[PDB]
Amino acid sequence: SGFRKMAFPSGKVEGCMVQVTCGTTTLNGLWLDDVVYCPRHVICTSEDMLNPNYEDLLIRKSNHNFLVQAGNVQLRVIGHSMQNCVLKLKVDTANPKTPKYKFVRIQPGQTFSVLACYNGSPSGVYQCAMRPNFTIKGSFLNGSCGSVGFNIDYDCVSFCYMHHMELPTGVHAGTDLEGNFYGPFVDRQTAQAAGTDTTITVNVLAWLYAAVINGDRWFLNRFTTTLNDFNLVAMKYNYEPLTQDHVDILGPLSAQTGIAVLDMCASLKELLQNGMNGRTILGSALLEDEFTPFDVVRQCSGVT
Amino acid sequence: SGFRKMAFPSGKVEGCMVQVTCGTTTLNGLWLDDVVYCPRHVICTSEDMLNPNYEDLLIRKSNHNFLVQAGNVQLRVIGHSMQNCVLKLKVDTANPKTPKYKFVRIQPGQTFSVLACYNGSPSGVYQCAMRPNFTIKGSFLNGSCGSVGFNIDYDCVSFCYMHHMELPTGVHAGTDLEGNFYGPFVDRQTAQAAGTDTTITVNVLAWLYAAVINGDRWFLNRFTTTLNDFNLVAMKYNYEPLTQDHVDILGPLSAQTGIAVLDMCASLKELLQNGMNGRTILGSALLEDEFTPFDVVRQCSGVT
Numbered sequence: 001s002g003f004r005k006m007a008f009p010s011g012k013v014e015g016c017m018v019q020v021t022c023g024t025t026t027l028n029g030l031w032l033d034d035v036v037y038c039p040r041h042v043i044c045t046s047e048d049m050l051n052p053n054y055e056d057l058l059i060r061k062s063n064h065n066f067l068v069q070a071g072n073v074q075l076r077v078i079g080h081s082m083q084n085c086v087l088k089l090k091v092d093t094a095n096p097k098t099p100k101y102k103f104v105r106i107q108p109g110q111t112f113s114v115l116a117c118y119n120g121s122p123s124g125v126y127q128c129a130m131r132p133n134f135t136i137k138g139s140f141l142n143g144s145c146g147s148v149g150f151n152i153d154y155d156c157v158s159f160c161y162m163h164h165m166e167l168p169t170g171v172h173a174g175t176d177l178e179g180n181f182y183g184p185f186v187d188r189q190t191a192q193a194a195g196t197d198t199t200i201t202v203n204v205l206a207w208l209y210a211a212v213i214n215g216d217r218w219f220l221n222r223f224t225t226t227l228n229d230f231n232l233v234a235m236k237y238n239y240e241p242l243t244q245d246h247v248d249i250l251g252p253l254s255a256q257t258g259i260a261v262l263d264m265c266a267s268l269k270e271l272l273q274n275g276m277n278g279r280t281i282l283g284s285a286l287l288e289d290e291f292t293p294f295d296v297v298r299q300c301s302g303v304t
Numbered sequence: 305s306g307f308r309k310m311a312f313p314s315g316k317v318e319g320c321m322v323q324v325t326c327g328t329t330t331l332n333g334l335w336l337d338d339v340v341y342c343p344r345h346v347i348c349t350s351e352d353m354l355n356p357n358y359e360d361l362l363i364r365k366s367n368h369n370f371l372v373q374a375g376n377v378q379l380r381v382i383g384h385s386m387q388n389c390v391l392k393l394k395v396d397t398a399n400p401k402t403p404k405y406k407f408v409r410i411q412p413g414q415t416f417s418v419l420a421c422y423n424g425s426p427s428g429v430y431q432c433a434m435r436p437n438f439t440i441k442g443s444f445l446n447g448s449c450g451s452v453g454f455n456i457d458y459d460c461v462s463f464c465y466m467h468h469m470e471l472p473t474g475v476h477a478g479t480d481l482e483g484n485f486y487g488p489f490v491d492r493q494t495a496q497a498a499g500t501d502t503t504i505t506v507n508v509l510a511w512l513y514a515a516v517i518n519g520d521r522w523f524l525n526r527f528t529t530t531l532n533d534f535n536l537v538a539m540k541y542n543y544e545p546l547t548q549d550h551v552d553i554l555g556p557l558s559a560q561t562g563i564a565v566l567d568m569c570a571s572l573k574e575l576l577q578n579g580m581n582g583r584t585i586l587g588s589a590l591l592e593d594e595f596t597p598f599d600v601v602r603q604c605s606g607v608t
């Protein structure tokens with residue numbers, strides 16, 4: 001029993017972290033096979049960060065200008081290319097520690113672990129979610145760029161995020177491993193607004209199921225609702241509209257606990273209309289939305 | 305910027321996780337050099353768990369009865385001994401993946417990462433704290449026993465916890481790596497009360513500093529207090545009494561922000577007396593006490 005915001009073990013990803021220095025800029029790289037993936041803003045000085053012409057800036061760079069370091073050994077760059085907002089540095093050595101991996105682009109609401117790194121060295125690991133406005137709420141200082149977000153399925157690491165930016169709002173923006181930013185964000189030092197951040201309804205519901213499984217039942221009530229009645233309430237509180245797909249994905253949790261999904265929706269509706277009244281759910285005083293139904297099933301069943 | 309409940313990278317500890325089966329019981333072991341450390345309740349059947357005589361039960365066990373498996377290879381047990389509530393299995397092979405390590409017994413209020421494991425395989429990593437009542441609030445299902453708690457200092461892993469038990473209250477109890485339980489807990493299937501869990505005041509204060517550093521300032525006020533006046537308020541809310549040592553440890557945070565420790569104490573006193581009033585601090589609706597002053601300094605400075 002017990003319910004915690006848990007991250008995947010980070011070992012497979014630690015063995016891929018390298019340091020990439022270009023000019024005077026140092027950030028993190030991801031070494032998989034003979035390729036180091038890193039943000040393309042590594043070629044930028046602070047002046048050209050206001051409005052960079054990456055294609056023009058890259059012309060002035062050669063293989064020897066990209067310094068890649070794995071722990072203490074220098075990797076030899078034999079090729080370089082730009083793929084959207086990531087630079088791909090071909091090195092002469094395949095990473096001996098390369099895990100089985102995939103590059104996946106995730107949907108908002110989905111969760112992933114982040115291995116925060118500085119100078120190619122990992123400092124910590126935390127669990128977070130791709131917000132519906134395509135930002136993440138992480139912990140990223142200067143030098144953390146190139147830190148990756150990922151998931152694990154037994155032995156295969158599914159890389160989904162690469163950190164590139166902090167918006168003036170303190171939230172984080174980044175790309176998938178093909179260099180495509182999540183959301184409308186661009187790798188430029190310009191005023192970019194994050195957009196309305198809504199709450200991931202399917203995740204709050206899953207977390208309510210995890211709470212019931214782990215003992216917290218005070219929020220359970222004698223009421224039920226409909227998808228349309230609940231969604232009227234969801235809209236009012238800036239919650240994601242709940243669809244039949246969401247109800248389907250909550251099926252295993254609904255079945256395990258014996259609580260129908262629309263009954264849990266009525267509990268959530270009352271929590272939204274009345275607040276917690278000074279109480280907590282799984283040690284939290286607010287409705288947690290960074291646990292997908294898959295996270296709850298996995299944590300309550302011990303999938304290794 | 306940004307502040308997250310961050311765990312240490314778990315790679316160094318993943319390379320130490322093994323599976324230990326004794327009779328029909330399977331739990332996790334920690335392989336460091338030629339020794340596998342695991343809970344001694346591995347030799348127990350469910351019947352003798354009510355009141356085990358571990359010395360008598362251990363007599364009936366030989367080296368060959370302890371099955372140790374690292375990933376897929378079987379380790380050869382050439383010796384076995386009981387040290388308090390841990391069994392120490394001497395294997396014929398030193399773990400090639402043994403990191404630089406220490407065994408430390410931690411104080412309540414101190415935080416550590418837990419690598420939750422099942423069948424010697426890691427499922428996840430989370431950050432938690434040794435509560436003042438010597439319990440931890442983790443996530444541990446059946447088979448998680450032998451999962452360890454640890455800290456990292458550059459390359460040296462300081463093992464502090466080994467999971468042994470879940471109290472009927474859903475909280476967790478375990479030992480240091482010498483087999484000595486934190487708190488008054490015994491490895492028996494008997495009614496054990498956890499004790500009053502107080503809030504770690506020095507940690508809440510550190511987290512308030514982290515909040516100011518990261519933008520959250522609404523809770524800052526025009527008041528100050530004294531150690532004795534604040535402690536009167538702390539007692540009323542079951543908060544740990546704040547000492548001069550605590551004020552000293554908050555020195556670097558106090559200096560960085562320019563906010564004196566007793567001024568932050570007055571902010572905390574008002575938060576305790578008036579609540580959050582529907583507001584949040586670092587995305588939390590309650591006062592977080594699982595970030596030590598060292599955790600805040602480390603996370604706000606990027607120590608790898």
Ligand SMILES: *CC(=O)c1c(C)c(C(=O)c2ccc(F)cc2)n2ccccc12
Nearest residue numbers: 025026041142143144145164187188189
């Ligand atoms: C994240 C990181 O390590 C980093 C950033 C964000 C910058 C930077 O100045 C910048 C990049 C992108 C952007 F849109 C605005 C500003 N870095 C410069 C030098 C090293 C590391 C970083």
Ligand SMILES: *CC(=O)c1c(C)c(C(=O)c2ccc(F)cc2)n2ccccc12
Nearest residue numbers: 329330345446447448449468491492493
């Ligand atoms: C934690 C774990 O894997 C485990 C426990 C807790 C027990 C068990 O039955 C027990 C141990 C200690 C105690 F005081 C009461 C009950 N296990 C039995 C078999 C495998 C794993 C575990």
